[PDB]
């Protein structure tokens, strides 16, 4: 709780496999790399973005406002208002996934988290 920022850019190469249907609800190392390139396009202010830029990018991608609002509320679980590259790493996949004809609740599956939190009891 209370802000965070880790712009970790680590990638070997991005190979085009044309088979992004095996990692539907999981974050692949490709997605890990992709978050940086998409973040680049997010027009970062000083190495970071914000929820205002978040809504802008995803909306500009051709998604309806209700969908856009849902995606942002799904991205940063803590609702930090900044959306760090960590949250964006899981959020970026939503735009693509929903543009494939999908929808989802306010809770991501643990496979998509990769690191499950002990926030249940």
UniProtKB/Swiss-Prot annotation:
Expression (tissue specificity): Isoform 1 is expressed almost exclusively in the brain. Isoform 2 is detected in brain, spleen, lung, liver, heart, skeletal muscle and kidney. Isoform 5 is primarily expressed in brain, spleen, lung and kidney (at protein level). Isoform 1 and isoform 2 are detected in brain. Isoform 2 is ubiquitous in adult and fetal tissues with high expression in skeletal muscle, heart, spleen, ovary, testis and all fetal tissues tested and low expression in thymus, blood, lung, liver and pancreas. Isoform 1 is expressed almost exclusively in the brain, in all brain regions.
Disulfide bonds: none
Binding site for Ca(2+) 1: 76, 78, 80, 82, 87
Domain EF-hand span(s) in chain numbering: 63-98
Domain EH span(s) in chain numbering: 31-119
Subcellular location field: Endomembrane system; Synapse, Synaptosome; Cell projection, Lamellipodium; Cell membrane
Function recorded in the entry: Adapter protein that provides a link between the endocytic membrane traffic and the actin assembly machinery. Acts as a guanine nucleotide exchange factor (GEF) for CDC42, and thereby stimulates actin nucleation mediated by WASL and the ARP2/3 complex. Plays a role in the assembly and maturation of clathrin-coated vesicles. Recruits FCHSD2 to clathrin-coated pits. Involved in endocytosis of activated EGFR, and probably also other growth factor receptors.
Subunit structure: Interacts (via DH domain) with CDC42. Interacts (via SH3 domain 1) with WASL. Interacts with dynamin, SNAP25 and SNAP23. Interacts with clathrin-associated proteins and other components of the endocytic machinery, such as SPIN90, EPS15, EPN1, EPN2, STON2, FCHO1, FCHO2 and DAB2. Interacts (via SH3 domains) with REPS1 and SGIP1. Interacts with ARHGAP31. Interacts with ADAM15. Interacts with PRRT2. Interacts (via SH3 domain 4) with FCHSD2 (via SH3 domain 2). Interacts (via SH3 domain 1) with DENND2B. Interacts (via SH3 domains) with CBL. Isoform 2: Interacts with CBL and DNM1. (Microbial infection) Interacts with vaccinia virus protein A36.
Domain notes from UniProt: SH3-3, SH3-4 and SH3-5, but not SH3-1 and SH3-2 domains, bind to dynamin. SH3-1 and SH3-4 bind to ARHGAP31. The KLERQ domain binds to SNAP-25 and SNAP-23.
Name of the protein this chain belongs to: Intersectin-1
């Amino acid at each position: 709780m209370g802000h965070h920022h880790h712009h970790h850019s680590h990638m070997a190469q991005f190979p085009t496999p044309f088979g992004g249907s095996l990692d539907t609800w999981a974050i692949t190392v490709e997605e890990r790399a992709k978050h940086d390139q998409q973040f680049h396009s997010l027009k970062p202010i000083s190495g970071f973005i914000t929820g205002d830029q978040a809504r802008n990018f995803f909306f500009q991608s051709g998604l309806p406002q209700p969908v856009l609002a849902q995606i942002w509320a799904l991205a940063d679980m803590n609702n930090d208002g900044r959306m760090d590259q960590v949250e964006f790493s899981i959020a970026m996949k939503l735009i693509k996934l929903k543009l494939q004809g999908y929808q989802l609740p306010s809770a991501l599956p643990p496979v998509m988290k990769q690191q499950p939190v002990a926030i249940s009891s």
